[PDB]
Write a protein that binds this ligand. Structure first.
Ligand SMILES: O=P([O-])(O)O[C@H]1O[C@H](COP(=O)(O)O)[C@@H](O)[C@H](O)[C@H]1O
Ligand SMILES: [Cl-]
Ligand SMILES: [Cl-]
Length: 541
C-alpha cells in the first residue's frame, strides 16, 4: 500500500478510541454488540472490505450495518462477498485481527494483511453498503465512509435497505451485463424481480384470505409496503402490515418481530388478529420470517422455519414428479439442532428425503445444502432459502416434457427458481413462496399445521460470566466444556419422553442458549429449566 494511503489510514483512525479492555469476535453473523462500542470495529471492517474487493480483482463487496434480531441498543456489521454469500470463512480471522489491532498499529496490520493475503494493491476496491433503521446507523456509516475514503475505495451508500436487498444489490452489480445477470442493482430492480417471479409462479391459482405481517417496526415495513405497489393485481394476495414504526427506534424488535414470536411462542401482545387470520412476523432487518395463527379454538399455533422448509420440500417434490423429472432433482433438507424433532421425523418418514444437521448460522447451512440438486435450508427461527445446483437449473431450464400438465409444473419450477433468493435467504421472498405454495396446494394454515405435530419445546436464554468456557461439537449438540456438564444434560434428557436438550454459547449476544423438547408441555419446561440451572451454575463460578 502507497505511503499516502498508509498515512490517510492512521490519520482517519485518530478520530476514534478503542474501548478499554474489549476483545472483539466475529460471532455467528459478523461483529455485533452495544452500538457505543462499534466505531473502531466498523472502521476496521472498511479496511477489510477494501482488501477483499482488491483480492477479488475489484468486485463489489457489500457491508450491511445491522444487528438484525438484536434489541435496538445494538448494532453490527456484516460482510457480503461478490455473489451474495457471507464473507468467506477464512476471512473472518482477518477481520478479527484488524478489529483487535491497537489503533496506532492498524496501518501495520493492514500491510501485514496485504502480504499474507497477497493482494495486488493496484486493483480497484469497490464497496456498497446499507443499514437498517437503528439509531446508531448513520454515525457508523460515517465511520465506514471514513475508512473507505482513506483506502481510496470507490463506494456507494444505498441508505436504508433490508439485509436481503443489500445482498441482491451486490450480486446484481457483479453480474450486470453477463450471462449470469441477476437484475438491475437498485431497490426498484429488487421489487420488479420479486413481482415478476411471483406473477409467473402464481399463474392459474389464487391466494385465499388475508395475510397480516408484523414488520417488527423495522425497515421491512416500509419496503414491504413499497413491494406491494409492484405486485400483480389478481393473485388474491391481500397483505395487511402491522408494526411498521420506523420513527421510534425503541420500537424495533420490541414486543413483536419473528424473534419475539419464536422465543416466546405467542403472538405479539399488540396483535389484533382474529381467529383463523393467517399471520407472519419478519424481524428488524427482514431476514427471518415465521407464520402463525389462532386456530378455531382460539389457541396460538406456530409455523416456524422448519415448517417453511418442509412446506417447500413437499411442494418442490410434487412439482418435480409432476414435471417428469423427480429422479433428476434429488432434494435434501438442511437443519440445525434447534429444529423440532417432529420436523426431522417428518422429513425422514413422510417426505422420505435425506436431512443433514449443521452448526447454527446461515453460512453453515448454505455450505451443506450445496451437496444436493435442490438444497432446502431453514433455521427454526425463520432464516433460510432453497438453493438449486448448476445441474438442477439446467434440468429445470432445458427439460422438454411430454404433456401440458408436465409443462405447467416445469414452468412453475422455473418461476420458483427466479422467486427464491439464492444463497442467503430473503424473508419477504420466502413469504411470497409460502403464499404461492398454499395457493397451489389449496391449503389453509390448518392443513399446513396438520402435516406433523411439533414436540412441546422451550428456549431459555441464560446469562453467564464467561460464555467462552461453553465449547460445543457435533453440529453443536454436545458440550466439550465445561467438564462434566454434558454428562448432566445427557442424564436429564433421558428422564423425559422424547427428551432432547442442548446448550451452546450464542455468537450474536452475550448469553448461553438452552433448548429442550419433550412429548408433553410439563416435560419440556422441566427439562429446559433443569438444564438452564445446570448451565447457570457452571457459567457463573
Ligand atoms: O440476527 P440474525 O437474524 O442475523 O441471525 C443470526 O443469529 C442467529 C442466532 O445465532 P446465535 O444462536 O449464535 O445467537 C442464527 O441462527 C442466524 O443464522 C444468524 O444469521
Ligand atoms: Cl425505512
Ligand atoms: Cl435462547
Amino acid at each position: 500500500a502507497s505511503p499516502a494511503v498508509r498515512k490517510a489510514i492512521s490519520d482517519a483512525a485518530l478520530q476514534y478510541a478503542k474501548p478499554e479492555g474489549k476483545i472483539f469476535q466475529y460471532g455467528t453473523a459478523g461483529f455485533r454488540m452495544k452500538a457505543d462500542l462499534l466505531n473502531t470495529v466498523v472502521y476496521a471492517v472498511g479496511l477489510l472490505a477494501t482488501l477483499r474487493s482488491k483480492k477479488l480483482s475489484g468486485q463489489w463487496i457489500g457491508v450491511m450495518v445491522t444487528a438484525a434480531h438484536n434489541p435496538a441498543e445494538d448494532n453490527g456489521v456484516k460482510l457480503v462477498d461478490p455473489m451474495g454469500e457471507m464473507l468467506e470463512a477464512e476471512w473472518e480471522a482477518y477481520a478479527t485481527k484488524l478489529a483487535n489491532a491497537p489503533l496506532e498499529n492498524i496501518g501495520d496490520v493492514y500491510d501485514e494483511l496485504v502480504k499474507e493475503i497477497d493482494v495486488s494493491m493496484e486493483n480497484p476496491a469497490r464497496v456498497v453498503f446499507a443499514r437498517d433503521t437503528r439509531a446508531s446507523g448513520s454515525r457508523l456509516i460515517g465511520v465506514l465512509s471514513a475508512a473507505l475514503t482513506a483506502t481510496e475505495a470507490e463506494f456507494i451508500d444505498m441508505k436504508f435497505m433490508t439485509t436481503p436487498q443489500l445482498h441482491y444489490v451486490v450480486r446484481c452489480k457483479n453480474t450486470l451485463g453477463t450471462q449470469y445477470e441477476y437484475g438491475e442493482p437498485t431497490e426498484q430492480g429488487y421489487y420488479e424481480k420479486l413481482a415478476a417471479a411471483f406473477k409467473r409462479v402464481m399463474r392459474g391459482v389464487k391466494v385465499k384470505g388475508s395475510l397480516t405481517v408484523d414488520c417488527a417496526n423495522g425497515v421491512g415495513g416500509p419496503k414491504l409496503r413499497e413491494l406491494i405497489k409492484y405486485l400483480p393485481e389478481d393473485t388474491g394476495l391481500d397483505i395487511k402490515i402491522v408494526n411498521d414504526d420506523v420513527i421510534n427506534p425503541d420500537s424495533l424488535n420490541f414486543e413483536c418481530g419473528a424473534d419475539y414470536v419464536k422465543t416466546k411462542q405467542r403472538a405479539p401482545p399488540s396483535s389484533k388478529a382474529s381467529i383463523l387470520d393467517r399471520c407472519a412476523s419478519l424481524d428488524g432487518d427482514a431476514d427471518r420470517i415465521l407464520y402463525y395463527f389462532l386456530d378455531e379454538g382460539n389457541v396460538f399455533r406456530l409455523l416456524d422455519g422448519d415448517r417453511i422448509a418442509t412446506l417447500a420440500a413437499s411442494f418442490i417434490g410434487d412439482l418435480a414428479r409432476s414435471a417428469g423429472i423427480a429422479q433428476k432433482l434429488k432434494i435434501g433438507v438442511v437443519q440445525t439442532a434447534y429444529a423440532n424433532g417432529s420436523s426431522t421425523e417428518y422429513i425422514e418418514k413422510v417426505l422420505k428425503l435425506p436431512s443433514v444437521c449443521t452448526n447454527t448460522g446461515v453460512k453453515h447451512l448454505h455450505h451443506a445444502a450445496m451437496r444436493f440438486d435442490v438444497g432446502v435450508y431453514f433455521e427454526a427461527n425463520g432464516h433460510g432459502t432453497i438453493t438449486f445446483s448448476e445441474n438442477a437449473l439446467k434440468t429445470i431450464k432445458n427439460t422438454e416434457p411430454q404433456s401440458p400438465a408436465q409443462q405447467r409444473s416445469l414452468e412453475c419450477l422455473q418461476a420458483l427458481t427466479d422467486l427464491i433468493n439464492q444463497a442467503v435467504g430473503d424473508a419477504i421472498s420466502d413469504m411470497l413462496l409460502v403464499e404461492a405454495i398454499l395457493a397451489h396446494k389449496g391449503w389453509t394454515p390448518k392443513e399446513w399445521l396438520a402435516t406433523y405435530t411439533d414436540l412441546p419445546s422451550r428456549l431459555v436464554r441464560v446469562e453467564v460470566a464467561e460464555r467462552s468456557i461453553f465449547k460445543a461439537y457435533d453440529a453443536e449438540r454436545k458440550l466439550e466444556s465445561p467438564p462434566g456438564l454434558q454428562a448432566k444434560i445427557d442424564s436429564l434428557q433421558s428422564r423425559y419422553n422424547k427428551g432432547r436438550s442442548f446448550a451452546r454459547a450464542s455468537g450474536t449476544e452475550d448469553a448461553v442458549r438452552v433448548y429442550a423438547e419433550a412429548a408433553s408441555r410439563s416435560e419440556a419446561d422441566d427439562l429446559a429449566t433443569r438444564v438452564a440451572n445446570a448451565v447457570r451454575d457452571a457459567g457463573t463460578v
